[PDB]
């Protein structure tokens, strides 16, 4: 009925691996893992319930329903070789990482520029609202308290990643689609957005020419943002004051809200606008949006 | 809306035989459903009794309040309901896309493969009904339920056509591949190779906790089996199938066979259709039924109760 009970990580002390294991533990799965040396990472994992093996031997994979490996599927590893011989699924860590969105309210931040900063800004505003998300930057899981505890999983989505077209987010942001086959690149972003359920939300920067271009092709609920006169969630009254930028944000069915972001540059007004759309969608108060954006120090 | 962005779905032409079933399921899921049609009918009256809001005629205002519009297929920008929706960035989707989407809300069992999808879908529905699971099932783009409340049960069984635009966007809990056959396409080319990758990508839409049900009698299914990084149960007459038919006795139009299953005693079943392919269709059904926890008696009675599509 449920065909994954025990997940085994080959190299579980690795920087991308330990976080995923911790989330799977918080989800209630049995997690085991092998690593070449014990560390604070593995010791923390066993206290969360991981079964830790030092060294690689075939028997370490016994009982596992699925194996997670760092990247390449290396049959020279005896744990992997045992799994493959017995037809146990072996998946790269990026695929298990994407899979985590199936269990959480996933917010995927895509686009050529601004993914990392916007992900960080969302995490800071959600923290100010007490929503304490787990968020993924550079393939590493962090919390804003065990990983995966929160209802929310905020993750950058890199268009060049093999897992990009397999995410199952509830909310997807596209900040821009930039040339830095471009037409195949556009279709990739359209297919990404159609992985939203019909009750999900596509958050689209209409200041970006290509995002605006593909907007009518997205058959999912949308909120647009930008400085553009037709953006649903719009920045006006922008006054750049040294290291902080003040602006008023217009939102559908809300009074104008005066905010500031504690970083200069017009692109950071855009990163903030994306964050505001998302925080607004989750019911975060004006006060928490103001504190998260203006209290922010950097990625 | 906030957090959940679909509350009301509007159907243009809701009285159509392909549309009314989808509306009924969405109503059973708890959504608000509205629909327009050129004339009232017994179909619209039934939908109104289930809670649908019915509009006769097409006027832009019929779409007011809708979060998503469903059209039969083509998106006709001359239709005032469609045009009003598009003007407001309300998604307008063909019914095949809304139909695919229903699997997200249900324990979806998608039956794929070049041959046998309809019979296997029907047999699974027959066995799940015998097990008291009251499945809704999809053959030919039409929704059906065990008896005559579409969508009431957790279970949704649907054929998955590789040539459909929604094929690589299904979210099943269980996926079947009966075979991957080139038919009149040649075997060792680029076209057939793209078809293989399509089936592999389809199976990778299973969650890691889902199940891939794979006919290893088929050469191409056997070929792609090592690429599937999902839990798999294989079936067939092959000696190495996890779930195997043996002791096959073809009796006119009725076929007896014994099924071997891991950790189970051999089970004698029969199907009321001739041909080894119907033994294969039955084996796929037994794998899924076994995985679901359905009793031997429901598997036997479900398979023998089926007379045809
Ligand atoms: C940290 N960071 N964050 C960004 N964020 C966004 N950048 C843009 N576009 C960009 C932009 C915006 C204004 C002037 C020049 C450019 C160039 C590019 O076009 N669009 C956006 N929409 N939502 C967010 C966002 C962009 C950047 C970089 C460019 C400093 C790496
Ligand atoms: C109704 N129906 N149902 C089927 N079901 C399955 N057919 C096959 N194989 C197929 C087969 C079988 C016998 C002769 C020719 C072919 C071609 C392909 O090879 N494999 C299977 N695995 N699970 C189920 C199943 C097949 C058929 C047809 C062929 C009568 C349309």
UniProtKB/Swiss-Prot annotation, chain B:
GO cellular-component term (any): cytoplasm
Keyword S-adenosyl-L-methionine attributed: no
Cellular compartment(s): Cytoplasm
Disulfide-linked positions: none
Binding-site residues, ATP: 113-119
Lineage per the UniProt record: Bacteria, Pseudomonadati, Pseudomonadota, Gammaproteobacteria, Pseudomonadales
Family to which this protein belongs: Belongs to the MurCDEF family.
GN (gene name): murC
Key word Ribosomal protein present: no
Keywords annotated in UniProt: ATP-binding, Cell cycle, Cell division, Cell shape, Cell wall biogenesis/degradation, Cytoplasm, Ligase, Nucleotide-binding, Peptidoglycan synthesis
GO molecular function terms noted in the UniProt entry: ATP binding; UDP-N-acetylmuramate-L-alanine ligase activity
Catalytic activity: UDP-N-acetyl-alpha-D-muramate + L-alanine + ATP = UDP-N-acetyl-alpha-D-muramoyl-L-alanine + ADP + phosphate + H(+)
Protein name: UDP-N-acetylmuramate--L-alanine ligase
């Amino acid at each position: 009925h449920h065909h994954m009970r025990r997940i085994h990580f080959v190299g579980i002390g690795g920087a991308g691996m330990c976080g995923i294991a911790e989330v799977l533990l918080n989800l209630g799965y049995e997690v085991s893992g092998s690593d070449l040396k014990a560390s604070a990472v593995t010791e923390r994992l066993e206290k969360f319930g991981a079964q830790i093996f030092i060294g690689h031997q075939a028997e370490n994979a016994d009982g596992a329903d699925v194996l997670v490996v760092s990247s390449a599927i290396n049959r020279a590893n005896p744990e992997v070789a045992s799994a493959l011989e017995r037809r146990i699924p072996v998946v790269p860590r990026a695929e298990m990482l994407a899979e985590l969105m199936r269990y959480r309210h996933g917010i995927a931040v895509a686009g050529t520029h601004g993914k990392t900063t916007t992900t960080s800004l969302i995490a800071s505003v959600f923290a100010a609202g007490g929503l304490d998300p787990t968020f993924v930057i550079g393939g590493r899981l962090n919390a804003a308290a065990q990983l995966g505890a929160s209802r929310y999983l905020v993750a950058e989505a890199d268009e060049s990643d093999a897992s990009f077209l397999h995410l199952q987010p509830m909310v997807a942001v596209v900040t821009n689609i930039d040339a830095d086959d471009f037409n195949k690149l556009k279709k990739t972003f359209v297919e990404f957005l159609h992985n939203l359920p019909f009750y999900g939300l596509a958050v689209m920067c209409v200041d970006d020419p290509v995002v605006r271009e593909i907007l009518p092709q997205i058959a999912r609920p949308t909120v647009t943002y930008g400085l553009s006169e037709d953006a649903d969630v719009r920045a006006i009254n922008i006054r750049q004051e040294g290291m902080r930028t003040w602006f008023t944000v217009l939102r559908p069915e809300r009074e104008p809200l005066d905010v500031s972001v504690n970083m200069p540059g017009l692109h950071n007004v855009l990163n903030s606008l994306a964050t505001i759309v998302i925080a607004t969608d989750e019911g975060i108060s004006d006060e928490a949006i103001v504190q998260g954006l203006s209290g922010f120090q950097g990625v």
